[PDB]
Amino acid sequence: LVPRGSHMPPRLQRFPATASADEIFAAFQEDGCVVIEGFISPEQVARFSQEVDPAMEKIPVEVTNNGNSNDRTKRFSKCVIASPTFRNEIIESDLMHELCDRVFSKPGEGMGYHFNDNMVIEVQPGAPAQRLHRDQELYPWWNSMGPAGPECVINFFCAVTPFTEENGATRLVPGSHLWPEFTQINERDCPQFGKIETVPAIMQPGDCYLMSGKVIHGAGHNATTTDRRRALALAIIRRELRPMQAFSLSVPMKLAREMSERSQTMFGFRSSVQHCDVVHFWGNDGKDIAHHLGLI
Amino acid sequence: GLVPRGSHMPLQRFPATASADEIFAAFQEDGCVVIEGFISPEQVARFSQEVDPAMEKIPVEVTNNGNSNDRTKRFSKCVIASPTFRNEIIESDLMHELCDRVFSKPGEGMGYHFNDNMVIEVQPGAPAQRLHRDQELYPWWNSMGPAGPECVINFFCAVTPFTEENGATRLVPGSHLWPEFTQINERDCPQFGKIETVPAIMQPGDCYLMSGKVIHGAGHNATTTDRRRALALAIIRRELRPMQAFSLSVPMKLAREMSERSQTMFGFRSHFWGNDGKDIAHHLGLIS
Numbered sequence: 361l362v363p364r365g366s367h368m369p370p371r372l373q374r375f376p377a378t379a380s381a382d383e384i385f386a387a388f389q390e391d392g393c394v395v396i397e398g399f400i401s402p403e404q405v406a407r408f409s410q411e412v413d414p415a416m417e418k419i420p421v422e423v424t425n426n427g428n429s430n431d432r433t434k435r436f437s438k439c440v441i442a443s444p445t446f447r448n449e450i451i452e453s454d455l456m457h458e459l460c461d462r463v464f465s466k467p468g469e470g471m472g473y474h475f476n477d478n479m480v481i482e483v484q485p486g487a488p489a490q491r492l493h494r495d496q497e498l499y500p501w502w503n504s505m506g507p508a509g510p511e512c513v514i515n516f517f518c519a520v521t522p523f524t525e526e527n528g529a530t531r532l533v534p535g536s537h538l539w540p541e542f543t544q545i546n547e548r549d550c551p552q553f554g555k556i557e558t559v560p561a562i563m564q565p566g567d568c569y570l571m572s573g574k575v576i577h578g579a580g581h582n583a584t585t586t587d588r589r590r591a592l593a594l595a596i597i598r599r600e601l602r603p604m605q606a607f608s609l610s611v612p613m614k615l616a617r618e619m620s621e622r623s624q625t626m627f628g629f630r631s632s633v634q635h636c637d638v639v640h641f642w643g644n645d646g647k648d649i650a651h652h653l654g655l656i
Numbered sequence: 657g658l659v660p661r662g663s664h665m666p667l668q669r670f671p672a673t674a675s676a677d678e679i680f681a682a683f684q685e686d687g688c689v690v691i692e693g694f695i696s697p698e699q700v701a702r703f704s705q706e707v708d709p710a711m712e713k714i715p716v717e718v719t720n721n722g723n724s725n726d727r728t729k730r731f732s733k734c735v736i737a738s739p740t741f742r743n744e745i746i747e748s749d750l751m752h753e754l755c756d757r758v759f760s761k762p763g764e765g766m767g768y769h770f771n772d773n774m775v776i777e778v779q780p781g782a783p784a785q786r787l788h789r790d791q792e793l794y795p796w797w798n799s800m801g802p803a804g805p806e807c808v809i810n811f812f813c814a815v816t817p818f819t820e821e822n823g824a825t826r827l828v829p830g831s832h833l834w835p836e837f838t839q840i841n842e843r844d845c846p847q848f849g850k851i852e853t854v855p856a857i858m859q860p861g862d863c864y865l866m867s868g869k870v871i872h873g874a875g876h877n878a879t880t881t882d883r884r885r886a887l888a889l890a891i892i893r894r895e896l897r898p899m900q901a902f903s904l905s906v907p908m909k910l911a912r913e914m915s916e917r918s919q920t921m922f923g924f925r926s927h928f929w930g931n932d933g934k935d936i937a938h939h940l941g942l943i944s
């Protein structure tokens with residue numbers, strides 16, 4: 361695309377949502393991130409945006425006097441409550457669960473993952489760029505295991521409205537999941553500070569990128585005047601890690617009863633069973649918590 | 657003069673009235689430490705009585721299969737079953753004092769919450785448990801070695817007395833400072849078979865605070881009638897998932913009677929475990 365002799369920026373691989381999960385996972389392993397085009401259908405993504413739009417209108421845009429604050433970005437996590445399309449269809453992506461199993465699920469131990477968050481992230485016009493970071497920084501000890509550590513968290517980060525370089529599409533650093541040392545990206549700790557090359561995740565509505573918690577990234581500057589850049593972050597963690605949202609305590613049981621068993625597991629309405637040499641996480645005295653809740 | 661001069665020397669003891677800094681210093685040195693009278697004598701007796709009808713309804717497995725349920729009863733509904741547990745035992749200021757030093761960072765509130773409230777009662781004849789570190793439950797933790805942060809700690813309280821014969825836990829002090837944290841088996845542990853233990857001999861109300869990095873295991877209960885009953889207060893970093901879904905099983909009535917700090921321990925109160933920017937205690941009806 362660029363004239364010969366031009367520097368070539370890093371490559372984000374792209375696959376259709378009809379590609380095999382093995383093909384997409386291979387790219388995720390090589391680079392730490394990969395675009396899945398059509399992850400959500402344009403009709404599903406439009407119904408979702410319409411369904412969460414009243415709640416987004418009620419959230420005020422926060423403007424502050426520190427640019428390093430990551431302001432002018434609306435954030436909304438009650439996707440299940442607000443959106444039938446989200447809870448009936450979006451969280452039922454088999455391709456999403458196929459990839460989560462290839463990341464998180466251990467032999468004969470059931471689902472190895474659950475939801476960390478379901479966040480609509482709408483970056484307002486003029487919002488400053490977000491600091492470069494790894495998402496596993498949320499679990500502060502994880503970087504110390506280096507690239508040899510297991511996965512903490514992954515994110516299916518979906519374009520709800522278009523992602524462009526101008527409106528603040530996430531800037532990603534492919535291959536940063538393989539750097540020898542994982543530090544915070546600051547002047548004191550990161551030798552490459554200020555010299556780190558990123559690439560934007562350009563996406564159409566319904567596209568998503570799957571991104572390892574080991575990948576350096578940061579929301580871009582929204583340099584536009586009118587583009588509210590809407591995203592949906594499906595953040596998925598190991599079953600042994602604590603979620604950012606107490607979904608089982610805020611999502612009503614009426615909606616829990618309508619969930620598939622794997623979706624109840626995702627939100628903590630149903631337990632999981634790990635094997636330690638010769639134990640339930642999130643259980644109830646040896647039983648699945650789903651018994652006590654009436655979920656059978 | 658603690659062992660005969662010339663002999664090989666083979667676990668410090670403090671009273672609950674001692675300072676948390678003194679108990680924590682020994683905890684840092686050895687990875688475990690006894691706190692005598694951690695729960696008052698009348699409290700542990702009320703507790704034991706209060707959970708005895710729960711324990712009598714637990715059938716005993718006689719399996720010879722080598723897992724931790726072979727002739728060992730385990731029960732986790734201590735808040736539901738015991739007023740003494742939820743009203744007094746969990747409201748120990750020292751427990752929180754020590755939890756703050758293990759887990760909390762300045763300006764960030766409580767850095768810890770409950771993993772489990774488990775009554776463990778080793779039945780007569782139960783084989784000894786496998787040697788393990790409690791942080792094996794979070795399976796990547798050993799890979800960080802002794803430089804890694806603290807994962808889980810356990811206030812392991814004697815409910816009936818612990819003897820060398822009825823199955824008192826065998827501890828390996830200082831195993832939190834070994835250079836490699838491995839599984840403790842013949843295949844993975846070069847020191848297997850030569851690992852030196854000390855038993856945790858305790859009266860009712862005593863406990864030992866143990867680090868999740870310390871190797872240990874329950875002993876064989878070679879007796880005929882002694883059901884060695886224990887109470888394990890497993891506490892984890894706030895970033896880690898509990899083994900019990902306490903905020904879904906403990907009724908809202910009892911949560912309303914908890915202090916703000918106990919609500920946080922059970923997840924009735926929230927960073928992590930929030931509700932779309934707000935404390936989950938708001939939606940639950942727990943903030944004034």
Ligand SMILES: O=C(O)CCC(=O)C(=O)O
Pocket residue numbers: 481483490495528529530531577578579580591
């Ligand atoms: O909004 C974006 O594009 C990035 C958001 C993000 O990376 C985060 O919130 O951790």
Ligand SMILES: O=C(O)CCC(=O)C(=O)O
Pocket residue numbers: 724776778785790823824825826872873874875886
């Ligand atoms: O019962 C004991 O003495 C030890 C039990 C224990 O360590 C466990 O179940 O994790």
Ligand SMILES: [Fe+3]
Pocket residue numbers: 493494495577
């Ligand atoms: Fe991020």
Ligand SMILES: [Fe+3]
Pocket residue numbers: 788789790872
């Ligand atoms: Fe143990």
